[PDB]
Amino acid sequence: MITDLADNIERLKANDGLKFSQEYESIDPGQQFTWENSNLEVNKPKNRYANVIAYDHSRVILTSIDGVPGSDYINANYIDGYRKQNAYIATQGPLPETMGDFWRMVWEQRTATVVMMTRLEEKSRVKCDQYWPARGTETCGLIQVTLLDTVELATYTVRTFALHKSGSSEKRELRQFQFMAWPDHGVPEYPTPILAFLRRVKACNPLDAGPMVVHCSAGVGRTGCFIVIDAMLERMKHEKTVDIYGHVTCMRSQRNYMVQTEDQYVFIHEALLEAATCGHTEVPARNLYAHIQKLGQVPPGESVTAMELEFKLLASSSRFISANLPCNKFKNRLVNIMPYELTRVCLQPIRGVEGSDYINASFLDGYRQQKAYIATQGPLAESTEDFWRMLWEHNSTIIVMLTKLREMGREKCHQYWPAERSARYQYFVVDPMAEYNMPQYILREFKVTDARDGQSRTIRQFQFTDWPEQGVPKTGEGFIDFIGQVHKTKEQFGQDGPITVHCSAGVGRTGVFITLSIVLERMRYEGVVDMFQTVKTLRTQRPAMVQTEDQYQLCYRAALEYLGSF
């Protein structure tokens, strides 16, 4: 169904995207509805937007609070899922006065998962009101809400609550997943991040849970996307097919404008095409050994190993204007590797210095935070000043070097740091303070001072020296320890900036470092490993992360290693 889907997407996308527009504007459930309850004088203040109501036939009705008019109303509607009516609940971002009603719907519908598709504030405008306690427990109407734990990751946050309805002994658990990676304007660049989010929500929604309640601002746009994508994912899994037009049409028959923009309709097509193309490449940790075993074999209709094809599929799946500027020609070590405009690390210009805002480096997202790493080439004599400028400007106080200064008779990296006496690079005077030479790596400490104001910081450089000049490490044991030292030292000294990582071109050895940094910790906290999605994602931030298949294989070997060390 992949080729079909991709093909269908091709004609709709053709000619300024004419047929997509025609198809989208054609969505029509063909029914006449009513919403008296939404328009009752008593209920109007309960609607976030007067033009976003709930159809009477599909609305989620709250049990009535006898003697209190309008008490059965909330702006929300049931939404059909794959092969099951009313599988979800689409609702608006609660208002201060509907907070108790919202939690009451959660209790009554036996909901175990809340999906928030918005930030509380976007573009300085209020999209939703915070309806959960920032700490401890609060009472919203008849429901006691206790915040138990919060886990903030790069693209989303998970809050775990305990619920109690006053007047009863029962205690329930509620998990809120808030997606933080949707752009202020338009839809997301790639579907990988939302696809991953969808995956986690599903893994954590218990088997006996009532309908998940999904919401954004009006509870029609982003909410509609998450729901239609989740339903279609469940379908292509059981039927290897997909009917986006039909489902959106069914959604609209249950609620106000589900999937409210044409661009959202396209994003939905793109997201499901990638899901069908990549499949689910995640494996539980306890199955890592077995998985690696199979990756070493040749699949049925294939010629090479499953491992080689997986890596090869990482490729198969001009934002280089600055890097290609004539004034920056000699600021690139290996010209086949240049930073994407979107994620290039920019520097403050210097009058009279052409391209003074350029350095061959990219911002890469980590497990718990975005821009947690700066992937860059081994500094050149020509870019050494720019390198130190970049570290101060972007507050990076942890440097990771993955090569020797020279290997195989050629320079891999220029010695951009002072060894004996102090040295100044632009406005920064760097004093060498300590150098610890260990069996497999070196740790150097530097005092860096801004001569303009006398402010200083301590910069720590970790240089792994045991990487074979040809090939890759055999076990990855020493490298794993190295990864732990770097991050332990960062947390220890409370350094909050990004970690700058470099090798030759900042994509190969640097790719293994960052890939493992993410994967090894996620395996520790989530019990799963998804090498493919990790590298696929890093590659949207800098080209060629994890350059060769043997480096990719080492990533798997090292994860297995770490797994056994538990």
Helix residue ranges per DSSP H, 279-369: 288-295, 306-315
Residue in the structure block whose two tokens are 């001569």? 451
Annotated binding-site residue? 201: no
CA angle (47, 48, 52) in 5-degree steps: 70
Q: What is d(CA 269, CA 273) in angstroms, rounded to the nearest whole number?
A: 6
Residue 544, classed as helix, strand or coil, is coil
How far apart, in whole angstroms, are the C-alpha atoms of residue 13 and residue 26? 16
8-state DSSP, 545:
S
Residue 457 parent element (H or E): strand 455-464
Contact 201, 223 (CB under 8 A): no
Distance, CA of 198 to CA of 532 (rounded, Å) = 17
Q: Which residues contact 84 (CB under 8 A, 6 or more apart)?
A: none
Name the catalytic one among 128, 216, 413, 555: 216
Instruction: Tell me the C-alpha distance between 294 and 292, whole Å.
Output: 5
| CB-CB contact of 412 with 502 (8 Å) | no
Method: X-ray
**Per the annotation, does 22 bind a ligand?**
no
Look up residue 140 and give its two tokens: 């919203």
Does domain 281-565 fall under CATH 3.90.190.10? My reply is yes
d(CA 88, CA 78): 6
CA 485, CA 449: separation in Å to the nearest integer?
Answer: 25
Asked if 48 contacts 216 with a C-beta cutoff of 8 angstroms, the reply is no
- φ/ψ of 291, rounded to 5, equals -55, -50
What is the rounded CA–CA span in Å between residue 75 and residue 92? 6
The amino acid present at 52, given as its one-letter code, is V
Residue 13 burial by Cβ neighbours in a 10 Å radius (0-12, 13-18, 19+): middle
Report d(CA 396, CA 363) in Å as an integer. 12
For 98: left if phi > 0, alpha if psi spans -120 to 50, otherwise beta; the answer is: alpha
Residues 6+ apart with CB under 8 A from 11: 19
Give the CA distances from residue 495 to residues 398, 429, 458, 489, in Å, rounded to whole numbers and listed in that order. Answer: 8, 20, 10, 9
Whether 30 has a binding-site annotation, put simply, is: no
Q: Please, are residues 75 and 89 in contact by the beta-carbon 8 Å criterion? A: no
Start-end ranges of CATH 3.90.190.10 in the chain?
Answer: 1-280, 281-565
Query: How far, in whole angstroms, is CA 23 from its chain's centroid?
Result: 31
Cβ-based neighbours of 171, under 8 Å, separated by 6 or more? 162, 163, 164
Cβ 146 vs Cβ 83: under 8 Å: no
Amino acid letter, residue 344 = R
Structure tokens at 194: 């939302």
Q: How many CB atoms lie within 10 A of CB 325?
A: 13
CA-CA distance, 268 to 262, in Å (whole number)? 10
What is the β-pairing status of strands 373-376 and 499-502?
parallel
DSSP state of 183: -
Q: Would you list the DSSP string of 459-523?
A: EEEEEE--S-SSS--SS-HHHHHHHHHHHHHHHHTT--SPEEEESSSSSSHHHHHHHHHHHHHHH
Angle between helices 18-26 and 262-278 (to 10 degrees): 110
Instruction: Tell me: is residue 413 an annotated ligand-binding position.
Output: no
**Fold (CATH) for 1-280:** Protein-Tyrosine Phosphatase; Chain A (3.90.190)
> How far is Cα 105 from Cα 73, in angstroms, rounded to an integer?
10
Angle 168-174-175 from CA coordinates, rounded to 5°: 170
Query: If you write DSSP's letter for every residue of 228-262 in order, what string do you get?
Result: HHHHHHHHHHHTS---HHHHHHHHHTTSTTSS-SH
Active site (annotated) includes residue 216: yes
Strands 121-122 and 125-126: antiparallel
Give yes or no for a contact between 337 and 377, defined as CB atoms under 8 angstroms apart: yes
Cα–Cα distance, 212 to 503 (Å, whole number): 46
What tokens were used for 196?
Answer: 């991953």
Alpha-carbon span 404 to 366, nearest angstrom: 25
Q: Is 503 a catalytic residue?
A: yes
DSSP string, 374-423: EEE----GGGHHHHHHHHHHTT--EEEE-S-SEETTEESS---S-SSS-E
355 is in an annotated binding site: no
Q: Do the beta carbons of residue 48 and residue 93 sit within 8 Å?
A: yes
Three-state DSSP state, 364: strand
What b-and-e string marks burial along 410-441, b requiring 16 or more CB atoms within 10 Å of the CB? Answer: ebbbbebbbeeeebebeebbbebeeeeebeeb
Query: Hey, how many other C-beta atoms are within 10 angstroms of the C-beta on 445?
Result: 14
The answer to whether 282 and 529 are in contact (CB under 8 A) is: yes
Please give the span between the terminal C-alpha atoms of the chain, in angstroms, as a whole number: 42
Which of 335, 484, 472, 463 has its CA nearest to residue 403?
A: 463
Coil/strand/helix, residue 338: coil
Nearest-angstrom CA–CA distance, 489 and 494: 8
Whether 529 and 523 have beta carbons less than 8 Å apart is answered as: yes
d(CA 166, CA 2): 51
Nearest to 176 by CA among 227, 125, 106: 106
Is 220 labelled a binding residue?
yes
> Using CA atoms, how far apart are residues 503 and 510, in angstroms rounded to an integer?
6
Neighbours of 557 (CB within 10 A): 16
Residue with tokens 């044409």: 262
Taking each helix axis from N to C end, the angle separating 192-204 and 531-538, rounded to the nearest 10 degrees, works out to 150
| CA 337/CA 343 separation, integer angstroms | 14
**Any idea which residue has 């734990």 for tokens?**
149
By the 10 Å C-beta count (0-12 exposed, 13-18 middle, 19+ buried), 306 is classed as: middle
DSSP assigned state of 350: B
Quote the CA–CA distance of 557 and 283 in Å, as a whole number.
Answer: 14
Q: Are 437 and 429 in contact (CB under 8 A)?
A: no
Please give the structure tokens belonging to residue 114: 């809340």
| DSSP code at position 363 | E
How far, in Å, CA of 153 to CA of 420, rounded?
41
Inter-residue contact 398 to 490 (CB < 8 Å)? yes
Contact 141, 104 (CB under 8 A): yes
Would you say 184 is a known binding-site residue?
yes
How many angstroms is the resolution? Answer: 2.0
Distance CA(269)–CA(187), nearest Å, equals: 12
Exposed e or buried b per residue across 54-90, where buried means at least 16 C-beta atoms within 10 angstroms of its C-beta: bbeebbbebeeeeeeebbbbbbbbbbbbbeeebbbbb
What distances in angstroms separate CA 313 from CA 271, 308, 529, 549, one per listed residue? 17, 9, 18, 11
8 A C-beta contact, residue 400 and residue 413:
no
Selected catalytic residue, list 128, 225, 413, 503: 503
